[PDB]
């Protein structure tokens, strides 16, 4: 599974939320729904990763797997598959 | 559509295309505004827009992709890249980025990048792993750039004469000393066309500082490669910005193992602009020249090197003398002993009105054994020994007389042998 | 009857008009009040009244139509135009508007525009679809303005000498190096006379900065084209705004495929005014002049070009040297090599009373091949070869006495041979 | 035959009325009075057009096909012959 860069708007919104520390509402590609906080946007082995923690879980995921993200103060943005 | 082609179309076609899509009274403002309006109208339809540009990173941290058709002039059509994306891909100034753009949202004025799919003519991932320019070890030039076309035309003669006077290799550092009337512009145009013909793989950029608009237009028409220029009516900050954009683009291209050539007209006006913009350090030399100011043009000139790894950066910059201003004389005295190649033009030769007006006895190259072969080097030494006694006007007239019937340099050497 | 017709009408005929039309009071010396009353009465009769003016767009947003008769001076008789009409018809500074004019209402010191019927000698529909000036591609001057008249008098001697020394073409950026006393005004006057006589189609404009009213009046009387000037008593802002007026009008005229000629006496005074008006940028270069002060004079000078699409702009500027102020010298130094044609005036020849006092060895054009033919170029080559090695004042005596008994430059060229 | 542009005075009055965004009284050829607002004057093909949303019809009319307009805030205007 080769990784493709996400659109600039999605990454910019994610970085803004990360440095502003919002309780991000996340939905996975497989459909997993989770309320947690993104601590830092870190890229390892040329594929951009993201660490999201809820009660210290600090689980790692690829940015391609995230389809949409929402918060009360910002609109729900759906990433572009192409 | 693609933004680059839109920038390449003439103004009347732009007006027709805009009126086709419903824009009104767009024939009476800036071309950049026309492009911005038609791009916004097209993006309102929901189609994707493709665009490219060279990245300039401002002092705040965000960057702007500027186009080279407007000589990197700031305009509404410049693309905006946030600092988050400059952090994502390790982008430096001078990077040529191509990708998709999105229309500005509420509260935004400039178009914003949407997805990067080419960085410096390569993949976004691969261009991240390129070594920086100054980490590369410089070397003496050894790959000769031959200016002789060999078609036997009267335009080739100048190139041939130049090849006999001061050969150029890849990564050279040349200085063309130019009195006012002598045909410096003709020499630059001949060099540019010879580079475009003989060596198409080398990236060629022509930089003009404080040039008249008609000269800029005729150079953009004549030169096959890249021409960016700043007219004399523009402020000094414009000249400085265009020079730094050119040099960073060249450095980024060389980092990818590419030959780059920069023809500069002229280093004197660039130094004057840098003196104007740079604040005084308190130590003002003669002619109003500030010692701190000359530091940056010296960096521009010294960036020319032959990288030990693949690649090279040649810079051939002209310098004006006998201009009646102490500023130019001081700049010449500063820059005199810094060039690998030195080519002198003579006012009194052009007084007789024979071309090219090149001073043979005072023009040469440093470590010219590396560029040329042993036989050609010994032939050049023999010719230099023959030429030396004669005066410059007589030298040029005799050289041109002997260079007429011969078609190539080897035939000329053979004719001189007997 | 038109507003300008009553404006340039002197006292007797306007008084007769008032008394035959039925004006109650005719013992008022102030013409503004009687014009206002007579226009009010024309409005009351329902008879339409027309007018003409030149647009000025103030930074606040509305426009004022000034008049060229008062050298584009602000006054109560200027025609007010609201921003709505500026938004309807794409009109910027320099446009000339003629059409219906509405009398001022309660709350208007100035007459309000009613209906436009002509813009730039063109219908508004066709005037709204002309490309902007800086979108046009500059070019070298290819068609020359022959100033050699058939009069054969002593006035034609200066014109013939100027034709021989340095040809002038439409779209040429000119510069006149001159000492404080060289008879420059006579040279400018005869140049303007030749331009008006030989090329009536070309719009001739003469602008003076910081001049005494007497020569302003004599120029307005003796020059066939428009003459605009600013007296020395007026501040620098007046000169700045009048130069902006003339340059914007020239640009708007050029946009309509018209050849516009501007004589500028002098660039030194305009640069002085611009230096004095611009706020300081915090850094002052040698001579007490600001670095950014010269930027706007440079923009004014650089607007001269030969547009490829159609039309031309020929700016011929005079420069003053050795005036005793080093700021004038540095102004000339940053205005040194930006002009296509140059003409140097020598103080010594002026002292010797030789008219004209031009310098053959220090004058000439950048591209004589485009303007002239082949045989003309060779004859000029021969003349330059003859004159250059020897002196200049005696060369001028030679030139004037050689043009003495001859009438046509071709006959003189024949005589100078053998 | 020929199309003449309307005078600047009435045009600037009507655009001022549009800017003030007040209530508007409109009349038809038969003299029917309606309460609505003229949104904006659109300049297409060098010709001014006015769209009306009085009853949602969004009907388009040409600027030379209206005799005159009157408003309560300002004085009623009369279109001059020249």
Author numbering:
A (entry chain b), D (entry chain a): 3 to 84
B (entry chain B), C (entry chain A): 1 to 418
Paper text:
Multi-particle 3D refinement with ~600,000 particle images yielded two cryoEM reconstructions for each sample, corresponding to two ρ-Rof assemblies. In the first assembly, ρ forms an open hexameric ring (ρA-ρF) bound by five Rof molecules (Rofa-Rofe), while the second assembly represents a ρ pentamer (ρA-ρE) bound by four Rof molecules (Rofa-Rofd). In the presence of ADP-BeF3, we obtained a ~1:1 (ρ6-Rof5:ρ5-Rof4) distribution between the two classes, whereas in the absence of the nucleotide, the equilibrium was shifted towards the lower oligomeric assembly (ρ6-Rof5:ρ5-Rof4 ~ 1:3). The reconstructions do not reveal differences in the ρ-Rof interfaces, irrespective of oligomeric state or bound nucleotide. The local resolutions of the reconstructions decrease towards the regions corresponding to terminal ρ subunits and bound Rof. Weaker density for the peripheral Rof molecules could indicate a higher flexibility or a lower occupancy. Rof molecules are bound between protomers ρA-ρB, ρB-ρC, etc., but not preceding or following the terminal ρ subunits, ρA and ρF.
Bacterial transcription termination factor, ρ, is a hexameric, NTP-dependent 5’–3’ RNA translocase and helicase. A ρ monomer contains N-terminal (NTD) and C-terminal (CTD) domains connected by a flexible linker. The CTDs jointly form a secondary RNA-binding site (SBS) at the center of the ρ hexamer.
